[PDB]
Design a protein around this ligand. Structure first.
Ligand SMILES: [Zn+2]
Ligand SMILES: [Zn+2]
Ligand SMILES: [Zn+2]
Ligand SMILES: [Zn+2]
Ligand SMILES: [Zn+2]
Ligand SMILES: [Zn+2]
Lengths: 481, 240, 481
């Protein structure tokens, strides 16, 4: 059987159906509006109502509130409101169809086939892999034939996100460093033949003088990996690549500066930064975006042991700078210090890194937006514009020499791994990373607060969220224009 | 133009009592009143040709046998009920009535200042004071004002996302603390938005720029008086 | 308009409707089963499905899964399963009718009019009093005329509970000691003319030598009250009363042993014990139960101040025993010590007290059951049997001299207010109270873990739960037989 998701707008006499809803109402000789009318209150945005037996092929029709037809970019909220309405409403419709165990659903494009595809595929996603109680996986399809490219591009963007949620969600004993490197490799090679994957072993990592990455890694028995992803999509094979770097800690216990036990299981998602940048690169190659992109993810685990990093140790990063490890839980900093050095080798046009770096970001913006520190207002503008379309917001945070001073604490080393005071922890972790970039166009995104979803963005179940993957794909999309 | 300032003259936390460590700095919880009143004294010394009202609710927040209890529902001047879930989120409560009264004056602009939240300190920690504003015009004038004074301002988001977190019904129209711990500056500001209907309001969270240690060199270590010159400079330029 | 809630049983060909569902299906010429059939999967227990436009008078019909028709008493779970199924299913049906803002609902009795009334009235309850956003309050009515007494007795039992949730939920600055005493007075006097209410002031309380109650009270500015409720429902006016005692702390801050800030707002519900026993007595008088019942609730607030109780103080209870107050947050103990002395004055047949005494009860049984300590297996049996009918369980906990030894710590006093070790805190708080009863039939119910509902019992919204009020009404009901 099929289910049909149909949208309507908020209230004229009648609140308007979409063209597809209106066309369905004519095909059932006015029944759909009749029952909608005797059924109760007008549906508002994100609200659904389900009707049965109106048509032989659609035993379940779910009508969904899209909000005001007029909705556009909201200057205060910094997103396109209308598309947010369409993702929210279609996900709520689709999820009613899966609770009735119906295996396929025709979705009305609602005026924007791309965001309706994104609502349906985000909305229906689940991670029930290691459970014996799995949900019915239903397959969403565009209702109609008129903008199947826009539907399929949304399908594409919502899967990139879903790959990243899956990557993040999987338990750390399953998603080890080589296992993640293998999933990404497999996915990237299915995306395009214009790809190259290098799963670099410890041997290579130590030939590259990556001392601060290697010192995080040694306290675990799990072999680290340096994952080098290439998408050569430019016609000019010598066109300078954009490089994405991502913190891939596959589990963070804290090391010897050990984490509290409460809710420590969420640190399986400390490789969110690698999940995010690698999924956006798989999507860019599926999209055959005409640009060269390198992806760099140092993968390792941070564990207490008799060979772990000790508070006070001084390690040497690939640029020769010494780093005093004052707290072993400020490990991503260390990892990214070498990876951001290596990023420069590629002669990049742009360097963007992503990391679940700091609980300070969560106290600061708590999932309303991911924080970005950038030395370039041009980069800031392109990322900000990219998030107005996706609804997955970005908010700029300061790169002031003020926070740098706080981490240039000599004592034994050139730089300290944690700021001198507790204040502005996101700001001093970003200033730490500035010490390893000499590039005029670098952006640091702190993903820690947008790592999980509970109820905040309606089209995502409660779980690891995969954010800001579509802001990154959209940024690449527009850049390759 | 009306300036409003949190004047808690000492904050112990009430029954949600503060930890003992470094509690002496809450003598500076009236920093918001100190800041807006000093800028108005300076504007009148400067004979700036504008009308300015300053509004500072002054009181102390102490545990006693008549103190506010966690869970109480109080009624603000606009009739909204407010569930006091934590008595240490008191400035919120104080400013809720004062920002109602601010509207009586038919103001061109409403700016309030408060040492509201240690979350601001975790967020920007004295590199800048945080400002939440429903107007980019206000943001631009304040930002420009701080380029001259060196005493920086950094915009922070007023998203309905943080509002949802504080519109927790349970007993009241609004809760006094956000549902989750995340984004505490952002949900305290969204709480205050519930009491303004004015198209040009700015909320400055002064908590992280309250003290100086070594960060801005021309100030000894002590209570810093920030962002007073950004405010005087903003008034200066406005009266041009 | 009306909504109709109709139940069906789990699966024969067809899963069976109730008589009312079956009768409605005949009135719509087979439409209801037809649409039920094309609509999706068979409803299981507590699941609902809503159908629109089957009949002019019922634009919304909500069909609800009752589980197996055969369900009876479950030996492992210690409740009547079937009635639990009916409360759960009818509440879920009724709440669909309120989300559509329909103001009245006909409810199918489902084979047990009493539990269907209880599901509907519990299910629909809300506490939105001080909000400007209130829900539509819908009015549930029995579908039919055949067992309107059973429907109305369930209405009665579910309101007693709802009075107690409301009492518990209200903020402590509104529900002060005289305000609560006034609500209870007003309600009891509407229940019967066979009632007497005494709101005893401080003056009386100090003439009665109630030193340990008075020492909790003095640290707050709010005047304490001793509430004495009488329901003379026996034909023999000299028939010995059953007495119910309840801890009425209207807000507990901890005093000088001050509570942590986190979630302290829930201590507005520390008068749950008074709420519970007073609501059961209002219900017993509405039910014109032929017995004499006295209700005793010491009401006060526990606050830090310059006149509050100090850790180490020795106070004197009404029986002359000294009590060392080692921790001021073990105040209910102190309050109940005088009230349980006074209870003996009444020459009672039975003494039952209820108190949100101990977070140790919550660690022990955590809302699966309220804990009862009783020196009588006869009392235990009657309470246990009473909870098999209501589904609101009771679990016996030990009154061993082992826990008594732990609190007979002399040092300055006859008894200490907290046990010597942290272990068995519910057990040593109950052993403390045993020191003030000389009656052969006393039961202590520790209500702390069943104080709130989140998701655990389906027919209650998330909030203060009013438990175990119907176990108490049911116990009185059977006793007066
Ligand atoms: Zn860490
Ligand atoms: Zn980490
Ligand atoms: Zn405070
Ligand atoms: Zn304060
Ligand atoms: Zn207590
Ligand atoms: Zn208590």
């Amino acid at each position: 059987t099929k289910g049909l998701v149909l949208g309507i707008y908020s209230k004229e006499d009648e609140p308007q159906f979409t063209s597809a809803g209106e066309n369905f109402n004519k095909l059932v000789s006015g029944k759909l509006r009749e029952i909608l009318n005797i059924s109760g209150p007008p549906l508002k945005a994100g609200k659904t109502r389900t009707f049965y037996g109106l048509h032989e092929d659609f035993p379940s029709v779910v009508v969904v509130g899209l909000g005001k037809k007029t909705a556009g970019i909201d200057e205060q909220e910094n997103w396109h409101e209308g598309k947010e309405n369409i993702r929210a409403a279609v996900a709520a419709g689709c999820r009613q169809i899966q609770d009735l165990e119906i295996p396929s659903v025709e979705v009305d494009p609602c005026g924007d086939a791309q965001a309706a595809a994104e609502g349906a595929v985000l909305g229906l996603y689940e991670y029930d892999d290691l459970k014996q109680k799995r949900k019915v996986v239903v397959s969403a399809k565009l209702h109609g034939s008129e903008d199947q490219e826009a539907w399929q591009r949304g399908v594409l963007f919502a899967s990139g996100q879903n790959l990243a949620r899956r990557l993040m969600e999987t338990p750390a004993n399953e998603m080890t460093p080589t296992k993640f490197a293998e999933i990404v490799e497999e996915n990237l090679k299915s995306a395009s033949i214009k790809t190259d994957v290098f799963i670099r072993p410890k041997s290579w990592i130590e030939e590259q003088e990556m001392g601060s990455f290697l010192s995080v890694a040694k306290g675990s028995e799990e072999p680290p990996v340096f994952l080098e992803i290439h998408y050569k999509g430019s016609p000019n094979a010598s066109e300078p690549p954009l490089v994405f770097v991502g913190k891939g800690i596959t589990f963070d216990s804290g090391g010897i500066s050990i984490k509290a036990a409460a809710n420590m299981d969420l640190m399986r998602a400390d490789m969110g930064g690698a999940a995010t940048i690698c999924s956006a690169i798989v999507s860019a190659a599926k999209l055959d975006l005409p640009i060269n992109i390198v992806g760099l993810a140092p993968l390792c685990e941070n564990m207490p042991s008799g060979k772990a990093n000790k508070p006070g140790d001084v390690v040497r990063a690939r640029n020769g700078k010494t780093i005093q490890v004052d707290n072993t839980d400020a490990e991503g900093r260390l990892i990214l210090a070498d990876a951001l050095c290596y990023a420069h080798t590629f002669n990049p046009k742009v360097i963007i890194n992503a990391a679940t770096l700091t609980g300070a970001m969560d106290i600061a913006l708590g999932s309303g937006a991911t924080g970005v520190f950038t030395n370039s207002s041009w980069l800031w503008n392109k990322l900000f514009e990219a998030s107005i379309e996706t609804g997955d917001r970005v908010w700029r945070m300061p790169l002031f020499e003020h926070y740098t001073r706080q981490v240039i604490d000599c004592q034994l080393a050139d730089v300290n791994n944690i700021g001198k005071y507790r204040s502005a922890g996101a700001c001093t972790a970003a200033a730490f990373l500035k010490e390893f970039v000499t590039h005029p166009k670098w952006a640091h995104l702190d993903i820690a607060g947008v790592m999980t979803n509970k109820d905040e963005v309606p089209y995502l179940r409660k779980g690891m969220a995969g954010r800001p993957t579509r802001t990154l794909i959209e940024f690449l999309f527009r850049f390759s224009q």
